[PDB]
């Protein structure tokens, strides 16, 4: 998955 808001 993604681990930061930018990638999210």
């Amino acid at each position, epitope marked *: 998955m*993604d*681990w*930061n*808001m*930018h*990638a*999210a």
Partner: antibody
Framework: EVKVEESGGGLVQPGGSMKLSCVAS????????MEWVRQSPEKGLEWVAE??????????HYAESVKGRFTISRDDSKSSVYLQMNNLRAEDTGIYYC???????????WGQGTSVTVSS | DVVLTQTPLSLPVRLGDQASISCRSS???????????LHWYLQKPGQSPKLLIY???NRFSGVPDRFSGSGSGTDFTLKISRVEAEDLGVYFC????????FGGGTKLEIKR
């Protein structure tokens, strides 16, 4: 002027519990993920737990090392994030930092930390 | 988990000179979306660590161009030009491409 301040640190016996609190200001709290990272002289900085947005049903994620023992929660109305620590172990000793998951893709604002010591 | 190895552990530097801190990851930090989430922070004694560079080379709020970040594969470098007294502290890298991890830090010492 983003501000982040943690509290609740202290000494706890192995197997005990304690809840850490963090209050932020200077931004719309509900629009950001919040994180807890801890620092120890033997593991350095280590990510502990993360809690996302309401639209994510407050999805949480934990480091394998604290799985099932720590619980992260937040109260947007009070711009606070919490870390309930149970079944504490000596390895949990360290300075606990509360951080904002930034829109830039990095934990962008940190508090000064609150110290936690698990000892007999 | 991704391991971030920083070097040197201690870095003595004269005022006005440049300091280079390295961070080497155990795996590529290139996210499928094309971004590389490698960041740099500075933690002064007793103070809250502060974000300096995000996504390899972007300067964060209030950070002067004296601070520059670069990367090549699994190697990343933080360069602090025209070092000044207030630059002392521990600089550390972190990545958020995979489960968040951090480098061990580099203590910048001012050589006077």
């Amino acid at each position: 002027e983003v501000k982040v301040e943690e509290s609740g640190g202290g000494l706890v016996q192995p197997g005990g519990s304690m809840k850490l609190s963090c209050v932020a200001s200077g931004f719309t709290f509900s629009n950001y993920w919040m994180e807890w990272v801890r620092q120890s002289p033997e593991k350095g900085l280590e990510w502990v737990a993360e809690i996302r947005l309401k639209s994510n049903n407050y999805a949480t994620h934990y480091a394998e090392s604290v799985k099932g023992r720590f619980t992260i929660s937040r109260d947007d109305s009070k711009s606070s994030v919490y870390l309930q620590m149970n079944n504490l172990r000596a390895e949990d000793t360290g300075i606990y930092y509360c951080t904002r998951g930034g829109a830039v893709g990095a934990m962008d604002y940190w508090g000064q930390g609150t110290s936690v010591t698990v000892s007999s | 988990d991704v391991v971030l190895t920083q070097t040197p552990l201690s870095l003595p530097v004269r005022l006005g000179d440049q300091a280079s801190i390295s961070c080497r990851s155990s795996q590529s930090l290139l996210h499928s979306d094309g971004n590389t989430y490698l960041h740099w922070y500075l933690q002064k004694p007793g103070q809250s660590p502060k974000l300096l560079i995000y996504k390899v080379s972007n300067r964060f709020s209030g950070v002067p161009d004296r601070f520059s970040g670069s990367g090549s594969g699994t190697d990343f470098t933080l360069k602090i030009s025209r070092v000044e007294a207030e630059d002392l502290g521990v600089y550390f890298c972190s990545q958020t491409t995979h489960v968040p991890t951090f480098g061990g830090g580099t203590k910048l010492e001012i050589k006077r």
